[PDB]
Structure formats: C-alpha cells, structure tokens
Amino acid sequence: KVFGRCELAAAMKRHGLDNYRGYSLGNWVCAAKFESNFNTQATNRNTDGSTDYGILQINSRWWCNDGRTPGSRNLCNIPCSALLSSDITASVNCAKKIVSDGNGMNAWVAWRNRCKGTDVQAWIRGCRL
C-alpha cells in the first residue's frame, strides 16, 4: 500500500518514534521516503542472497526470516512477510530493535546518505499530528 507523508508521520508518532533513541520524527519519515517511497510492499534483492523488505527495507540477513538467506539471525523474530503488511506495526517494532543495536539509524543506507544532517523537520511540515 502507498502511504501519504502526513499519514505515515502520524502512524509513526502513535508508535512513538518521535525522539526514539534520540531521533526526531522527521528522521523516520525521511528514511521511509528514500528507502521505499512510502510503498509498504517495496522489495529489493541483494547480491548476497539477502533481501530488503517493506517501507523501511529491513534486511533478511539479520532481522527477518525469509527462508533463503545465508547467515540468517532472525533478530526481530518475524517472517519477512510480516514486513510487507499494509499496517506498519511489524516494521516499526523491528526498526526499534535495529536502532537499539548501536548503529542508530546508520543501518539505513538511505537515511545516512540523504537524511542525516538535513532539515528533517521539513518532513512533517503541515502535518496536523
């Protein structure tokens, strides 16, 4: 499903991402935007047997189980399909675990290369959250 910018922002605040582990709301809306274009079904197949799933493009190597990736650790204890749902519940819950690793949002290549250090506050401009 394709989320709206304010629409997704609200879902994230509800799930408490605003300032989670010191990352303002804007960082997450920015990360989704560049990672999946806010498409809940976005999928990317890597060169290493791994795949990136959902709106936050979580990798199957360490976070979810898709049954075909080498070195699977399945740290979120979820099947990768849970990450392709129309509701963001599983993606948000797993994301909170990724962020707590010690890498922060640095685990997301899009955040690091496109959001990090910018005016992230613009991402929630005009939202009535």
Q: Which phi-psi region, left, alpha or beta, contains residue 77 (left: φ > 0; alpha: ψ -120 to 50)?
A: left
| Residue pair 94/63 in contact by the 8 Å Cβ criterion | yes
Task: Check the annotation: does 101 bind a ligand.
Answer: yes
Q: Which of 35, 48, 66, 119 is catalytic?
A: 35
Q: Which of 7, 18, 48, 52 is catalytic?
A: 52
3.40.630.10, 2.130.10.30, 1.10.530.10, 3.20.190.10: CATH of 1-129: 1.10.530.10
Q: Is 35 a catalytic residue?
A: yes
Name the structure determination technique: X-ray
Query: Could you tell me how far CA 123 lies from the centroid of its own chain?
Result: 15
Q: Is 52 a catalytic residue?
A: yes
Query: 93-108 as b/e, with b when 16 or more CB fall inside 10 Å?
Result: ebbeebbeeeebbebb
- Rounded Cα distance between 35 and 26, Å, is 14
| DSSP at 128 | -
